[PDB]
Short mmCIF file of C-alpha atoms and ligand atoms in Angstrom, two decimals:
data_model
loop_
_atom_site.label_atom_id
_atom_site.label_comp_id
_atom_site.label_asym_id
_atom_site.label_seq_id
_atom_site.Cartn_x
_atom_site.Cartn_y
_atom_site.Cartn_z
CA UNK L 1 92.84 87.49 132.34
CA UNK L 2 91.09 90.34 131.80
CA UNK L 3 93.45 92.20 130.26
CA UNK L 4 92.19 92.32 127.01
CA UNK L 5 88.97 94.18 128.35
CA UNK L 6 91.87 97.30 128.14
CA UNK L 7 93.11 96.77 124.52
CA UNK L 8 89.47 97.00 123.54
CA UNK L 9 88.71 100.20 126.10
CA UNK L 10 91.52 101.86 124.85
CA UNK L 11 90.54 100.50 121.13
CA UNK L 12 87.02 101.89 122.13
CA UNK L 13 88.62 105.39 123.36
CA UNK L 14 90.70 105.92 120.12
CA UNK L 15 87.40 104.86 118.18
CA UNK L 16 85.41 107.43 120.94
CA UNK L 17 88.19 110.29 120.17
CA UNK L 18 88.24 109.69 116.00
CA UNK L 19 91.82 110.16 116.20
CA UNK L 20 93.37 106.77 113.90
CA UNK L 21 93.88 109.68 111.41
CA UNK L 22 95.96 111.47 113.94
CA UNK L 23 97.62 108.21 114.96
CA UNK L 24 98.36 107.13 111.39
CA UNK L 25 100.05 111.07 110.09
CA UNK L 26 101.86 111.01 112.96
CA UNK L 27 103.39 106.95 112.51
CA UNK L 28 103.96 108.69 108.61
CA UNK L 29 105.78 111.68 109.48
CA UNK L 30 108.38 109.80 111.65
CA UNK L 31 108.79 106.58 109.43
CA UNK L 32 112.04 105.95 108.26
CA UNK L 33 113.76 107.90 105.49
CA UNK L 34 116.68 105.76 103.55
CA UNK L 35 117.74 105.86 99.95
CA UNK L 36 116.74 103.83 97.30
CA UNK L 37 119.55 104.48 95.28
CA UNK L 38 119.31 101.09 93.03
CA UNK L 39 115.40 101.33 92.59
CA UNK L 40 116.11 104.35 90.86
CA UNK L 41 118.92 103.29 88.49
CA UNK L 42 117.81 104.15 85.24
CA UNK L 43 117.88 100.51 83.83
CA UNK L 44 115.77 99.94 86.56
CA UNK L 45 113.09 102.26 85.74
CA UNK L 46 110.98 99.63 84.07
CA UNK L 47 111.05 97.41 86.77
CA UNK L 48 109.16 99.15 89.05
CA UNK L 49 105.44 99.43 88.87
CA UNK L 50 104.89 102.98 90.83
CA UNK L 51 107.30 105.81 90.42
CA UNK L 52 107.39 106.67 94.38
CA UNK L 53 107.36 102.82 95.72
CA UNK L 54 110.65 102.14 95.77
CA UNK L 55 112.39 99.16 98.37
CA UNK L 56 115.56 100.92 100.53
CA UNK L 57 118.94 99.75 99.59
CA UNK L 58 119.92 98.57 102.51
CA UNK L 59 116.47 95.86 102.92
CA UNK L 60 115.66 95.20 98.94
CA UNK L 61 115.99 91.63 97.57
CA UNK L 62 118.99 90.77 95.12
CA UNK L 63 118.37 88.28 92.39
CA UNK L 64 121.25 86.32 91.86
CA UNK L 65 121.93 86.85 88.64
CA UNK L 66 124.62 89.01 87.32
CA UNK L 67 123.35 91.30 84.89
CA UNK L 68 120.67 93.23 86.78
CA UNK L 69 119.47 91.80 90.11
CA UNK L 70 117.11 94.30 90.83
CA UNK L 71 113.67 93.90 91.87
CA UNK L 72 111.44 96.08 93.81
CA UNK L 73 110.89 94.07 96.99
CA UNK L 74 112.00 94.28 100.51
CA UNK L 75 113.20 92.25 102.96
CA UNK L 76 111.32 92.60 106.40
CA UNK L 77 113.03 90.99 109.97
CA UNK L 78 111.24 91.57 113.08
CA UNK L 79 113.48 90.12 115.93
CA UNK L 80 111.22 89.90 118.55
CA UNK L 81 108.48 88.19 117.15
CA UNK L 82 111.23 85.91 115.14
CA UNK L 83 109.54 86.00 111.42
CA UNK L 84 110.61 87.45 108.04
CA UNK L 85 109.00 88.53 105.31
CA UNK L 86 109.41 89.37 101.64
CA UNK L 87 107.22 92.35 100.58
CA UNK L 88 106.99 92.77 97.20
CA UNK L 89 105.02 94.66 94.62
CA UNK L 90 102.53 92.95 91.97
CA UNK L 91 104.85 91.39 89.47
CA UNK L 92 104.58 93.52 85.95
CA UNK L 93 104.57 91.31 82.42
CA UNK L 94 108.73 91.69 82.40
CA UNK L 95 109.16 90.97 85.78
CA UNK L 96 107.36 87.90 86.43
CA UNK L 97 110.57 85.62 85.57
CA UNK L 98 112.24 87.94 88.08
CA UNK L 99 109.17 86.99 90.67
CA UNK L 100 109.62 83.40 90.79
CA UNK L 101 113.68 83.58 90.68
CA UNK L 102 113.72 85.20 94.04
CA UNK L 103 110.68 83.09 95.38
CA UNK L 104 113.50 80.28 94.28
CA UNK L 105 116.72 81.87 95.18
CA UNK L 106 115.06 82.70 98.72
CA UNK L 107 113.82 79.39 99.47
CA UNK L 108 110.34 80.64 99.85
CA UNK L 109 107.75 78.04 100.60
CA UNK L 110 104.42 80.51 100.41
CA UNK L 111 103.29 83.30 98.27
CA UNK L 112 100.60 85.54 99.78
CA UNK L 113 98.53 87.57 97.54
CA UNK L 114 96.60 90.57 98.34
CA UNK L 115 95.15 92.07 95.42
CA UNK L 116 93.47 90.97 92.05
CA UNK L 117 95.27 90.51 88.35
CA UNK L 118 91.79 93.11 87.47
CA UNK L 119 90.75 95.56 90.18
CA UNK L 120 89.00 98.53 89.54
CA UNK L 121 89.46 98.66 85.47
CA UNK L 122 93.05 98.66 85.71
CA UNK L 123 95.52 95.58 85.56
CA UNK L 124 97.72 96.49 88.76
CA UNK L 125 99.38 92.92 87.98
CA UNK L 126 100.25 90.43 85.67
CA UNK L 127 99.45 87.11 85.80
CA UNK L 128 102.17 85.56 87.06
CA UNK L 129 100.64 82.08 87.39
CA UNK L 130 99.28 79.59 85.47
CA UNK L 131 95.25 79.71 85.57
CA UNK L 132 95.31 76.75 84.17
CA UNK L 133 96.72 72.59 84.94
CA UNK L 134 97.13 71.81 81.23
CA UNK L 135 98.57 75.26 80.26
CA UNK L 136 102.27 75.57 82.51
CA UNK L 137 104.11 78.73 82.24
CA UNK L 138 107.54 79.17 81.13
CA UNK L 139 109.94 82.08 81.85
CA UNK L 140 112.57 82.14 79.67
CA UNK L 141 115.17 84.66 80.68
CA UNK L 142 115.41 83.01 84.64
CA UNK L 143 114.63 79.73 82.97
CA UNK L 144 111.75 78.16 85.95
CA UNK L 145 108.50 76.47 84.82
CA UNK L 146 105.69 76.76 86.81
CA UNK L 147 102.33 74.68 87.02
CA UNK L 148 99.18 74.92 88.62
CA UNK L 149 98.58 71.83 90.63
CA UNK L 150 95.32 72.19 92.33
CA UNK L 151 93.44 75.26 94.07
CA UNK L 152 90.76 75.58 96.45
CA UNK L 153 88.46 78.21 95.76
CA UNK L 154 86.77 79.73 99.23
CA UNK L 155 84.35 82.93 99.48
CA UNK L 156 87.04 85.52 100.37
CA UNK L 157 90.00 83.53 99.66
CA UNK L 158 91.72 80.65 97.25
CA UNK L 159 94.89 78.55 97.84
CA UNK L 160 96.62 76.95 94.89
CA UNK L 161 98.88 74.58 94.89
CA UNK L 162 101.83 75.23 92.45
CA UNK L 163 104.50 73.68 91.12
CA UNK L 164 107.69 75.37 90.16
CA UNK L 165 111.01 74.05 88.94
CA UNK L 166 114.21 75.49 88.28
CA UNK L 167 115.31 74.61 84.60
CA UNK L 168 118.65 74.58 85.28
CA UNK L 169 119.33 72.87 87.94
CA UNK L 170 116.64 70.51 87.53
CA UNK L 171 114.65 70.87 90.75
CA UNK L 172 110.85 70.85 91.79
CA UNK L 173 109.21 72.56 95.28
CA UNK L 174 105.60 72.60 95.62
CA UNK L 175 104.66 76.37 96.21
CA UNK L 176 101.30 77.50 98.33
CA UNK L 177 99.94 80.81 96.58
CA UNK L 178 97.15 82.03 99.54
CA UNK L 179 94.84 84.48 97.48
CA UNK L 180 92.59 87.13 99.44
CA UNK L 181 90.59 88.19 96.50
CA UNK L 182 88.28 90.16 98.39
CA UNK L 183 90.60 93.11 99.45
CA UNK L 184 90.39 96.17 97.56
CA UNK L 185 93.12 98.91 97.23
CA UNK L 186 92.92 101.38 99.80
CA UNK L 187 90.45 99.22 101.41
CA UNK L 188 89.91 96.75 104.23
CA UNK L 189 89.23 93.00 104.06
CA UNK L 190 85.47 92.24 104.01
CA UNK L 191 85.93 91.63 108.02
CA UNK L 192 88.43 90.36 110.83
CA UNK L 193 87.11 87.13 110.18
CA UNK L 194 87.57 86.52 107.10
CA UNK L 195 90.90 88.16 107.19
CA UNK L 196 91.82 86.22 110.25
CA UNK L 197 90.99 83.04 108.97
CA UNK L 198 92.94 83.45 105.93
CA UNK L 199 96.22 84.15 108.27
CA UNK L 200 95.35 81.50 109.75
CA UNK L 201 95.34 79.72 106.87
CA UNK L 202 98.79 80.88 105.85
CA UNK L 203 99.80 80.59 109.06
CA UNK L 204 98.90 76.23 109.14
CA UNK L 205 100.53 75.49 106.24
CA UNK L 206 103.92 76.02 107.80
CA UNK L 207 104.44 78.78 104.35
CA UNK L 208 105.65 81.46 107.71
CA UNK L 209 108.14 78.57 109.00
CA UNK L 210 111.31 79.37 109.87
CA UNK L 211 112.04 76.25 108.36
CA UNK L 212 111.77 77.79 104.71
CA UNK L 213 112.77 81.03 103.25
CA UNK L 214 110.76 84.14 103.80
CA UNK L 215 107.26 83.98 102.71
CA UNK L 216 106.38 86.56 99.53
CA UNK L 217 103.44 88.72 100.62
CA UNK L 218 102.52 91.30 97.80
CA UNK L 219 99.47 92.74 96.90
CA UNK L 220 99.81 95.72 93.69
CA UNK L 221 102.45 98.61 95.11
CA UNK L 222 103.32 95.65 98.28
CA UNK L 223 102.70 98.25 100.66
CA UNK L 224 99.24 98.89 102.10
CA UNK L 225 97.38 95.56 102.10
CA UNK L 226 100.71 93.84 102.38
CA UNK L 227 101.63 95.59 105.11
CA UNK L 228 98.90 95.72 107.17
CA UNK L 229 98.68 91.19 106.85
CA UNK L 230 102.07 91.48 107.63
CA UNK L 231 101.52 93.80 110.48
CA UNK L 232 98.83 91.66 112.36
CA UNK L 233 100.50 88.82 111.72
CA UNK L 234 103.56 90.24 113.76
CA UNK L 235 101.44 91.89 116.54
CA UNK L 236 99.63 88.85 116.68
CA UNK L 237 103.24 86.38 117.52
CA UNK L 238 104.19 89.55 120.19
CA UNK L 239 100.73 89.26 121.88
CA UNK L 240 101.24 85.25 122.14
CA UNK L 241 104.88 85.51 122.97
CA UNK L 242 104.61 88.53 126.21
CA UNK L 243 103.30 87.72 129.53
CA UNK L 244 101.65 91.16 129.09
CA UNK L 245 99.76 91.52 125.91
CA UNK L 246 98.69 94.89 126.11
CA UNK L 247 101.98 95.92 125.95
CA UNK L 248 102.32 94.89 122.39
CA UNK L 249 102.19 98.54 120.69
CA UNK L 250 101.01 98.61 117.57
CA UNK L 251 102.10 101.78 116.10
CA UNK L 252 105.79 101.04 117.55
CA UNK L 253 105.87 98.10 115.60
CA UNK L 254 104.71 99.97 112.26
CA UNK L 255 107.26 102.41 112.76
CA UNK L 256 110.07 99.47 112.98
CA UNK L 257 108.45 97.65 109.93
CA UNK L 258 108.84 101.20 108.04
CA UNK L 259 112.31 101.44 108.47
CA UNK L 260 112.48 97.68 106.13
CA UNK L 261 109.60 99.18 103.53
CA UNK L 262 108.13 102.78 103.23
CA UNK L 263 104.70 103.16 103.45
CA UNK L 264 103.24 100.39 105.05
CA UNK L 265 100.04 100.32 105.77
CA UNK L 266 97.84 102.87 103.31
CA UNK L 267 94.82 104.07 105.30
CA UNK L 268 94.18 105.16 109.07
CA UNK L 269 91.35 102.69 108.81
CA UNK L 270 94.01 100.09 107.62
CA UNK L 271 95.65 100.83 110.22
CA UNK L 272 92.03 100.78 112.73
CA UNK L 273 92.10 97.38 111.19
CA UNK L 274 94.71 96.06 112.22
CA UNK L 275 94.12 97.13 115.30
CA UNK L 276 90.56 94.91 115.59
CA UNK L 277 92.38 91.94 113.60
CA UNK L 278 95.08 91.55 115.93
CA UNK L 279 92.35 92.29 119.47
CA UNK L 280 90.46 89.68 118.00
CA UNK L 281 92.76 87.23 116.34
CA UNK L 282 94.12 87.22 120.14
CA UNK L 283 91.26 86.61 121.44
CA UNK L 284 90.69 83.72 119.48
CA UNK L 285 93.96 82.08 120.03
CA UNK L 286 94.59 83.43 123.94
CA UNK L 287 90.81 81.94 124.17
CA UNK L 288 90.06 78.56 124.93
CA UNK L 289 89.66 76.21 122.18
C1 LIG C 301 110.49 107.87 103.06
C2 LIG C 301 109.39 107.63 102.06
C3 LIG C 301 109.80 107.35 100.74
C4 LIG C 301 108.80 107.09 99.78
C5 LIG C 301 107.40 107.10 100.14
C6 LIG C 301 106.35 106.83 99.21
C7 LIG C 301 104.99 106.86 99.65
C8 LIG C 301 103.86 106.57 98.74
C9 LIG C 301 103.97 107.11 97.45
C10 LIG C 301 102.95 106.92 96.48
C11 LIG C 301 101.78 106.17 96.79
C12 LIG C 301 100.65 105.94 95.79
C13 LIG C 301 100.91 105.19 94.42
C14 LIG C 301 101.39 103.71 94.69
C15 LIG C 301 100.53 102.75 95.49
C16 LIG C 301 99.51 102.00 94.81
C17 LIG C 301 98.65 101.12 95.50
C18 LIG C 301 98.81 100.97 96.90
C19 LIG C 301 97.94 100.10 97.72
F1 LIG C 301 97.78 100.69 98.93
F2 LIG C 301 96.72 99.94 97.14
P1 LIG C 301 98.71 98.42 97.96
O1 LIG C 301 97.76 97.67 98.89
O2 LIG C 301 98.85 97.75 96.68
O3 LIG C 301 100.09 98.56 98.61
C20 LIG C 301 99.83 101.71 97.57
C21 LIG C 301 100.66 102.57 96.87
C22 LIG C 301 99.56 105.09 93.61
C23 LIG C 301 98.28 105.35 94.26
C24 LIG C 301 97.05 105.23 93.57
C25 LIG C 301 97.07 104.85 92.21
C26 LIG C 301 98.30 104.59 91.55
C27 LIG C 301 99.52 104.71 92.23
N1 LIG C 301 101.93 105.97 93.62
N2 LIG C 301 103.19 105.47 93.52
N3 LIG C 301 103.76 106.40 92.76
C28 LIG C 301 103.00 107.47 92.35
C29 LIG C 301 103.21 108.59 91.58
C30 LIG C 301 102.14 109.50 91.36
C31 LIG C 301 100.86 109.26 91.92
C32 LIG C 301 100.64 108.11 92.72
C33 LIG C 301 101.70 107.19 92.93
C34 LIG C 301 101.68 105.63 98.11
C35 LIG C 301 102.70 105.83 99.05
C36 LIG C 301 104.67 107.18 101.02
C37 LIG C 301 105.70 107.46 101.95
P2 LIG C 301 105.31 107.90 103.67
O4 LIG C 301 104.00 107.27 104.15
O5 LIG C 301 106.41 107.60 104.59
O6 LIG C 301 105.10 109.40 103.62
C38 LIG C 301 107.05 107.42 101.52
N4 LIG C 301 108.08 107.66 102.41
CL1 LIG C 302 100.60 94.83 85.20
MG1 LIG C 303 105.52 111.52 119.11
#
């Protein structure tokens, strides 16, 4: 069908007209406003990583533990396409034991990294995994051990293959950490293909099956990279799943992944992104193969 000869008119037209900027201020100024009551607790202060990223009340992640079970991460559910996922920000050096407790506690299969431990001169995240097979990490106060198993190191990307077991209880899972390590903040991946790929990536490994417990997706705040993979990957199911995939509106679905996590997506050319990922990534899989 020739229906995707529209999506890439109108694509073409909003390209022609320079308005994403428009587009993107206007998605901003009518996202979702809900407290974050919690994420502000004073106890809590240190456990955030930006003072204006904050996850709502009503979407943020418990920890199951009973003295503080606060962590800045959100839950997102998008009924239609039938997928959930964890947004969270770049765990900080006290809150990587809190990291891997809810990547336990939530039965989470895959972890989807964004960023880099060192972009730009500043940290913007701990490392929160082992770098190393011989040299396991420990985290005392949530009592897990994890170890680095194996990774594959690709151009744009590298998947590691993790280890992490639950002290207490006694248990192992095997854990898939997908790394885009060319994305920088504020930025856009190096292309659609490359970014596609990677989702695909994620996407074959059965980490996103419903099977398991939301996959973690985080890049430093967990908002603008994060959201934007999390984005096309949700656009992308809708376009698969309607008879019609042009009518698959992008900006509507921002808007309801903005009422789980404010401000997703960073950039009107994030957003333009998306846009050409999720054309493209249908292309691919509506094309023949
Ligand atoms: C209803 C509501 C409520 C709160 C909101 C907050 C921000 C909202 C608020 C702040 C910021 C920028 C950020 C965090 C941030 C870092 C990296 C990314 C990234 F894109 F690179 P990523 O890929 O890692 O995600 C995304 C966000 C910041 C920016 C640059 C450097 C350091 C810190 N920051 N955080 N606190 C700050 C205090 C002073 C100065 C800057 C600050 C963005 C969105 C935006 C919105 P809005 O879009 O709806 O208007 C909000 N809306
Ligand atoms: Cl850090
Ligand atoms: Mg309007």
């Amino acid at each position: 069908k020739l229906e995707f000869m529209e999506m890439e008119k109108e694509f073409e037209q909003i390209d022609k007209s320079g308005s994403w900027a428009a587009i993107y201020q206007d998605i901003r100024h009518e996202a979702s406003d809900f407290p974050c009551r919690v994420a502000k607790l004073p106890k809590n202060k240190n456990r955030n990583r930006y003072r204006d990223v904050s996850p709502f009340d009503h979407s943020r992640i418990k920890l199951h533990q009973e003295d503080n079970d606060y962590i800045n991460a959100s839950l997102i559910k998008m009924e239609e396409a039938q997928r959930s996922y964890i947004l969270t920000q770049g765990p900080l050096p006290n809150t990587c034991g809190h990291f891997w407790e809810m990547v336990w506690e939530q039965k989470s299969r895959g972890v989807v990294m964004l960023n880099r431990v060192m972009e730009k001169g500043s940290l913007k995240c701990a490392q929160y995994w082992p770098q190393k097979e011989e040299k396991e990490m420990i985290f005392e106060d949530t009592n897990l051990k994890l170890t680095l198993i194996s990774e594959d190191i690709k151009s744009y990307y590298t998947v590691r293959q993790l280890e992490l077991e639950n002290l207490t209880t006694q248990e192992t899972r095997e854990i898939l950490h997908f790394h885009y390590t060319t994305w920088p903040d504020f930025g856009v991946p190096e292309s659609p293909a490359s970014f596609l790929n990677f989702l695909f990536k994620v996407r074959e490994s059965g980490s996103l099956s419903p099977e398991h417990g939301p996959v973690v997706v985080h890049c430093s705040a967990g908002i603008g990279r994060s959201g934007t993979f999390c984005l096309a990957d949700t656009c992308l199911l809708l376009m698969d799943k309607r008879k019609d995939p042009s009518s698959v509106d992008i900006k509507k679905v921002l808007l309801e992944m903005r009422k789980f996590r404010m401000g997703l997506i960073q950039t009107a050319d994030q957003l333009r992104f998306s846009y050409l990922a999720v054309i493209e990534g249908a292309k691919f899989i509506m094309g023949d193969s």
